[model samples]
Target: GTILIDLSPDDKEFQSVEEEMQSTVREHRDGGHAGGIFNRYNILKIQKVCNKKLWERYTHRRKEVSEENHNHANERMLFHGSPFVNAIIHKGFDERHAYIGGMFGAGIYFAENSSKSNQYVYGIGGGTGCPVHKDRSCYICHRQLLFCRVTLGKSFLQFSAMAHSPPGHHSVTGRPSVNGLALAEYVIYRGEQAYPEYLITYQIMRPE
Candidate 1:
């Protein structure tokens, strides 16, 4: 089944995840002035996702990919910023709910750059304007980001969108081009190919 483990703020796992978020944003800010506009975020809560079935599926795929790729699964911890925080945690990454006509087809999209993922985290409800949930009690106030472990086995690098990954390829990697993505994006067609490991909830600091 599925289990959500609430992590204590002082927990080592919690601190490491928090630091990853902070360092990612800091690195992005240092790259350009646009990212520097907002100050550091105040991390609110972090929950470790423990879904037995999902983990099994992901590991199964990882092993299959590893065998096919000469013992390299190419698993990476990536960022997936979305407003549907509650839905995702309960029901893994579903490409059917993914945005239509995405840059790399209708697949679950992920990014190595936190800033790029942050762009998608909009319409978050703090106390009032809950977009996804109608019940106020179910509303999530903080912006959420999923730190997922994705199996990008034998990824096919392309600059254009493809309806599906080519034969034998496990995932698609969108390369940065003038008319394409500003940062690289990874896309996998199967929902079972990814495991949502951590749920990071935080708020962006007001510009001073």
Candidate 2:
């Protein structure tokens, strides 16, 4: 099924300038927290939708825009034809979304611990946790991996990054330090050796 985000500016649920003003005024009148539906997340959600729409519109226009306006040229995507392209260009799918089985670990790892195998900008964890001494971003050469981790632990949408480690990296049970379901997003590139297996192809992109 097609995933659609309602972002019509005219839509009442999505506040335009007038809607925002009115909502704010109404909230003030009602002694605050009066409009439950128009709360912070709701407003931010609509704002996010609006921003996403505007971003899409401008990005599309950028392709047609020429260098006449600025000294530098408009940015062009690398690995144009290959899956190495960023998933944001073509919104990626939900890849391996499992429950908070184990704490997922992430840190500096490599393709095969050799010079030939590409060094990872970030290597992710499975059910456990992303163990890391320092914060890192996942990558494979220029082409990157792109996917968002969502909690399948709940029936409704439960948004969170999977627990990553501050030091030890992961645990059999959930990590004690972090709050919320610790899920994460990886925007990495595909490598010559497919992590462990080689058959995996392209997955969709999620914005970093």
Clashes of each: 0, 29
lDDT of 2 by residue, 24-112 (tens): 21112222221111222112222211134434444443332223324222231111111221332233211322123322332111111
lDDT of 1 by residue, 12-46 (tens): 99998888777666334223222223436778999
lDDT of 2 at 129: 14
Q: Estimate the TM-score of every prediction.
A: 0.79, 0.16
Candidate 2 runs further than 4 Å off? 1-72, 79-208
What C-alpha lDDT, on a 0 to 100 scale, does residue 53 get in candidate 1? 77
The alpha-carbon RMSD values of the candidates against the true structure, listed in the order shown, are: 5.6, 21.0
Evaluated against the true structure, the overall lDDT of model 2 is 0.22
After TM-score superposition, the amount by which residue 186's alpha carbon in candidate 2 deviates from its true location, in angstroms, is 19
